Design a protein around this ligand. Structure first.
Ligand SMILES: Nc1ncnc2c1ncn2[C@@H]1O[C@H](COP(=O)(O)OP(=O)(O)O)[C@@H](O)[C@H]1O
Ligand SMILES: Nc1ncnc2c1ncn2[C@@H]1O[C@H](COP(=O)(O)OP(=O)(O)O)[C@@H](O)[C@H]1O
Ligand SMILES: Nc1ncnc2c1ncn2[C@@H]1O[C@H](COP(=O)(O)OP(=O)(O)O)[C@@H](O)[C@H]1O
Ligand SMILES: [Mg+2]
Ligand SMILES: [Mg+2]
Ligand SMILES: [Mg+2]
Lengths: 663, 525, 564
């Protein structure tokens, strides 16, 4: 192979190459446009080291404090039924709806796998909404909290249009931390400086800047407390408060052992009351550090007063649910509360004590936030240019290897030169006629009929010095063009004023009678079986100029009928009343009928299909004839198509030129 | 070899490749699904160095204190009889039963090898249970401790369903430490910082977090008695198992299955020696008169299914023979071959059937006096075959019989003689052929293979034409060349060969231009 | 291939190479001249470290203070309708107009995408101007501020000519910082020194020096803020702790901190204030034009290298004679409905046809008859050009020549000779004309000709009539030579029918259009039909240096006349 060969192959397969490349580029463009844009916010932290500070920033203690402050365990996602509905909605200019939820307690299924309970909120209007967890429909309103079916939800400021759905997931606290930790990175940017570059990525540009500000601030607050934590009485308080609560907790644990030594409604409210108490208890410590390092009129402090008011209303409704329960359950619940809320308060104090000690160790003095988190409005992902460019390049190398495979795998004939390298005379190369009709009659000026006329004149010189005027036309494989060529060759020889007989000796699948107009009775079969005379089987082609003998009814023994001595009698009789007899036969590599008929034909030509037949397939056919005493004069390449690869591999594409005056 | 050759081989062996690859992927998927998921918990420790603290955390002093606190020497395993019962029980959604044991003293057999005594606890209900160490059944109840047979056991809070068994092992204290130390690792994560990342792996996600908390608190309480060590992150378990990594396991299963399928195909290609196309025989100068495909359809194929693709190939042999059997000494055609079950009886009997329908008088002589079964294939009056004629106890007229659905007469082999090769040397055999050569237009003689016995070389002296039948993949080119030269050495001229049993193969279409199978040509109705 | 081959190919394709290279260099020059020049200003900062000071200089706190001081969120751009209007206006010597805006508040559309609202200010004169945001026209004057339609704008000192438009964008504060941060860089230049080299690039040479001065002074004032607070914080608490010997002792500490508070400059010193390098740093015109030349050359070479390896047509008669095809002449392209042999007898192509006339006189002897058929492989290869001109050069030698236009499909010889179009060869073959009524004389010729007549529906079947051999047998007695023009053989079979009655048959091969295999296929298609092709005539040869190096000869021919 060389440059011309590969370039001709690329020109021939240009439709395949262009289609595959365009499909790959279309997929790349659809991904680059429909993929959710992911933004990046960054902040700058000044450290007075910074290698231990990196691991403390990415710790579940610092990050977990942000999850609690911003309620990052309440995952809200716009509902889009397909995997592309979100991307296309962004392209249509639809602003994504967002709802602000400040309190969410799901019934906490906590089954084998789904540790993340989920509900679906369908916006009805600007004020009220609907909820359906597992089909249970609940109507809710902004403002008034909902405590029904063991589902606590508080939706504030629905900013969306009616009909929009939202998937509201309550993912566990560690899952919220692991998601934040995955998108949150810390760097030094000088490897020696006290400068930390905190970056955070996410699909929401405003949210990730609020998160990175919360991550920075908790850290800033921590080392500011470090200065005031030494003289703080808080340490001595926990040193005294912890053993007291432990004794109370131990007392509660001992009592539970006494009463012990699953009511679906009574158990469900148990976890919810504890969950309200834990948040209320944690809110107590939260109000302490906020009221000191911040102000009361600060919006952060106002939220806690509202959130505490919310939880108090939640417990208030819960307390009434307890009083409405049987005393048999009210007994165990109060006992279970003193232990569960006992263990929780004990755990909080341990973390309070654990976190307090760390602040003291903090070898850091003053902490200053040089730069607060702002979001880069240009998304960092997806990188559209590198995606589309890879789509083009990947589509091209795929198109090339497919073309490279089809070139090395194809074995069919590409030019008459391949047949003539073996010593096979190719008398014509018939192109594909793009135009039950005879082509030589319907379109005499066709490019394929012009190639058959060149075969007519090549045969007039090759059929001389033959035994008789009988020409048998066979081939290797079916649908190679033996009936197309023989029937059209007979039509081009009939217009030259010669008497031609076309015998359809394909007693198996011959359809020449359908192609010429038929009195289907009394064909070649009826003659060979003795139930028809030679005069009753010859019929005239209407728009033709030659007579024809149809195959007749399909016999059960086609190869044995052709061996009858009547067939040679018909040819000897017809060879006296016609100037040329053309016999259409089945393919030789399918059946042996043509090798029987070829004994009585003075000239035999094979028809080779352009790309369907192989050179060895035609050589096997010519040698199967010679083995049966039939001398094949040459071959006729049929179905040639214009190909640039032939023009570069060989000098000629063998298709032929059009020559008419255009009018 | 080139691209077309290897691609044709891959197309031909696609069943083998697909089956081996699917078996490997099935094993990989079954492992990825049935292997016990192993979780990982981690904690963060602040050190005020940390290189000596790593070796102190992994010491038997710190770890041994955790074994004593959590009773990690009491090993409890859910009982599953197979090596996959645990994995499939997890797939069926069955929550694994767990029992809390706070006191366990086994009789401590402490024999030559089994330093880990074991019992089997079978849950009977939520409250009581059973115990069987070596068949000794003991009933126990949650709460009340058991001190019987030198076996102390205290089971609290059986959380399982009745019928579940549990293997309760009391492994030695060092074995409990060595197991913990094997799954417990310490890192620095900055190589300079005072931050220690304690990780612990295990099949129980809740248990390993309790163990790593105990290791942290024990190392904490020990360090105070580097000053104030601090526990930044208490141990929590990552809910996503770290092992088995299902994607890399299945991907390796696919890739390993493919490279195994390829080397097996690569071996079978380089190892096979049989004939692949008639071109191989004709490179040696052997005329192949036909290539008969395998007929996927005691019957004669030329009679049962005359439109068969194999009968169409035999008709092509009938016309090739009409041109090759002319200019022969007589009208006797002997059909032999190299190896048995190559198709000599299939071809000769069906060739006789396709020549009989053309109106010719054909005689099929079953001269396989050893394993000839043509009488069974044609319907037989088994008495008075060729053996009885050659041994003189039958006349030539009494041995010829007519094939019922045929059109040709046949002579069966008769009773198997003790001297088949010596019977064929009798002058009666040439008398039968000289007599039959006047009453029939063609005599087809079926013979044994030449590389097995010499009967065909004796018969081939009186046959004007001799053809060998080569089986497609079973016979080799040298095997057929050895056969033709063994005939010529005995004065028998083999006219050519008949390749039998050809199957459609893509490798032949790429190696050679033609697969030599043949086309189907009928009007579908 | 060798040196001579490639050099001949470069000489032949010199027009293509020169044109492609000149186009690439023209594009490179137009880019180097029309691209906006980008200047660079630098300042030097000295510090005792300087690695944390680099990240503090590039921070949104320091840079954001400069955006607020200089109003860098008010983007003003001269309005030029094309992507090159700015560059060419600079080349024409037009000084860019600039307007000073100190207050700008747009209605802040803040829609889905356009977070940067924009208006268009059209200068009317030195004093007043116009504004159009979305078609709403508002007239404004320098001085008096405008508060209308929710649009606040204060334009001072319009320095431009009337008619100039300006796009006034109010980009967000972060976008103004991100643009500044992208062009602002900090370096150390010693990696150990307390010297910081602040550089800033931009299209405005004066503006970027004002920005880099603001960045330096803001970082300077900021630096004092870090420490002058420290010495003030000590002084603050010391002033808060003043309660007599200790009072005098603290009075000494009172002034010691009053003096250390003021001298803020210490750690950071600005060695040099920002000045702009008047020579733009971009675009680098020399490297752009040089790359334009080199890229244009390697593109011209690979295109020439492709056309050389892809071409298959005939290049010399040697290619035909390697196959065993006798080439009797090589006719050059005549750069000059006329007969060339008559209009310009001294043409170089007619001199080559005369060489064919003498080569034929020796090749047409020992032939069956005096009929010469001229065919070819492809249409428009020169079969009618050569046969009609060959007939004209043989007619001047005193011979009776008959030119038969046997191209019954697209024959135009009657148009080329002057025609009584009735009664051509078609009318004769179809029987509706006598042989005497179809022969006509070429006016400025010297030979008779038979036109094709009306285009028949069956041209190949008419030529098979026995009348055609009767015409040739009759004409072969009244003429010394019969030249038959035929259609191409690879198109139709007419020439293979006619070639049976011709004693000599020659193929015409077009120089670069036909391939050697195309001519070999044609000669073998004739032989298959019983027509013996004597040889070939290469037509349309052009002078090529590649032929002179690949082969020894270009086969074009020399001009030989006395110039007067
Ligand atoms: N060169 C060709 N151009 C256009 N159509 C063709 C050509 N050759 C064959 N065909 C068409 O393809 C089909 C196959 O031809 P057919 O004579 O039935 O094949 P065969 O007898 O060899 O089995 C026909 O319908 C025919 O019209
Ligand atoms: N081309 C074939 N197609 C289908 N079946 C075949 C073919 N050749 C042989 N067989 C079957 O395989 C078996 C072997 O044939 P057989 O005549 O007994 O072999 P041989 O005489 O050479 O030892 C037979 O049962 C036969 O029916
Ligand atoms: N060597 C040549 N020099 C100049 N013009 C030529 C030459 N050969 C052909 N032509 C012109 O190109 C056109 C093609 O010639 P034509 O005889 O019509 O081709 P053909 O008969 O082979 O199809 C004509 O107009 C002719 O004048
Ligand atoms: Mg057909
Ligand atoms: Mg047998
Ligand atoms: Mg012409």
């Amino acid at each position: 192979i060389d440059l011309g060969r590969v370039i001709g192959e690329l020109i021939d397969h240009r439709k395949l190459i262009i289609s595959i490349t365009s499909v790959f580029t279309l997929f790349a463009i659809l991904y680059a446009l429909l993929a959710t844009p992911i933004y990046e916010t960054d902040a700058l932290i000044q450290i007075e080291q910074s290698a231990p500070e990196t691991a403390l920033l990415q710790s579940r203690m610092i990050l977990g404090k942000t999850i609690d402050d911003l309620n990052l365990q309440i995952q809200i996602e716009q509902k889009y039924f397909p995997v592309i509905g979100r991307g296309l909605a962004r392209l249509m200019g639809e602003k994504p709806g967002n709802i602000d939820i400040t309190r969410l307690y799901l019934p906490d299924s906590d089954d084998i796998s789904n540790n993340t309970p989920s509900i679906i909120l369908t916006v009805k209007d600007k004020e009220n909404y609907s909820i359906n967890s597992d089909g249970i429909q609940l109507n809710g309103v902004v403002g008034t909290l909902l405590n029904e079916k063991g589902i606590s939800l508080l939706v504030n400021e629905i900013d969306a249009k009616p009909g929009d759905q939202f998937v509201i997931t309550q993912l566990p606290r560690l899952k919220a931390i692991s998601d934040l930790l995955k998108s949150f990175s810390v760097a030094d940017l000088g490897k020696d400086t006290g400068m930390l570059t905190l970056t955070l990525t996410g699909d929401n540009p405003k949210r990730i800047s609020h998160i990175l500000d919360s991550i920075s601030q908790n850290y800033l607050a921590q080392n500011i407390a470090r200065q005031a934590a030494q003289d703080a009485k808080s340490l001595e308080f926990l040193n005294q408060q912890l053993p007291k609560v432990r004794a109370e907790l131990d007392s509660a644990e001992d009592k539970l052992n006494a009463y012990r030594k699953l009511n679906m409604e009574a158990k469900s409210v148990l976890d919810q009351i504890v969950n309200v108490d834990n948040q209320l208890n944690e809110l107590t410590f939260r109000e302490a550090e906020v009221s000191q390092l911040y102000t009361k009129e600060h919006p952060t402090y106002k939220a806690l007063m509202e959130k505490r008011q919310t939880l108090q209303e939640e417990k208030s409704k819960l307390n009434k649910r307890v009083s409405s329960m049987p005393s048999t359950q009210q007994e165990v619940l109060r006992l279970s509360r003193d232990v569960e809320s006992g263990r929780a308060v004990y755990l909080q104090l341990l973390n309070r004590q654990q976190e307090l000690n760390i602040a003291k160790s903090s070898a850091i003095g003053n902490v200053r936030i040089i730069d607060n988190a702002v979001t880069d409005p240009n998304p960092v992902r997806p990188k559209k240019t590198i995606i589309i460019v890879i789509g083009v390049v990947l589509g091209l190398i795929v198109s090339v290897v497919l073309v490279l495979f089809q070139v090395f795998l194809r074995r069919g004939i590409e030019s008459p030169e391949q047949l003539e390298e073996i010593g096979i005379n190719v008398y014509a190369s018939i192109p594909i006629s793009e135009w039950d009709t005879l082509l030589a009659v319907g379109n005499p000026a066709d490019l394929a009929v012009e190639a058959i006329r060149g075969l007519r004149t090549s045969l007039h010189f090759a059929m001389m010095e033959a035994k008789n005027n009988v020409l048998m036309i066979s081939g290797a494989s079916p649908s190679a063009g033996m009936t197309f060529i023989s029937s059209n060759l007979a039509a081009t020889i009939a217009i030259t004023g010669k008497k031609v007989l076309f015998i359809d000796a394909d007693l198996r699948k011959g359809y020449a009678h359908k192609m010429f107009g038929h009195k289907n009775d009394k064909g070649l079969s009826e003659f060979l079986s003795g139930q028809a005379a030679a005069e009753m089987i010859i019929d005239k082609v209407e728009g033709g100029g030659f007579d024809y003998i149809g195959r007749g009814q399909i016999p059960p023994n086609p190869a044995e009928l052709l061996m009858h001595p009547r067939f040679e009698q018909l040819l000897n009789w017809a060879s006296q009343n016609y100037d040329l007899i053309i016999i259409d036969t089945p393919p030789i590599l399918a059946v042996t009928d043509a090798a029987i008929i070829g004994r009585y034909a003075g000239t035999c030509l094979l028809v080779a299909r352009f790309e369907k037949n192989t050179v060895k397939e035609i050589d096997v056919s010519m040698k199967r004839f010679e083995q049966s005493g039939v001398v094949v004069k040459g071959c006729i390449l049929n179905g040639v198509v214009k190909k640039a690869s032939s023009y570069y591999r060989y000098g000629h594409n063998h298709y032929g030129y059009s020559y008419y005056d255009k009018k």
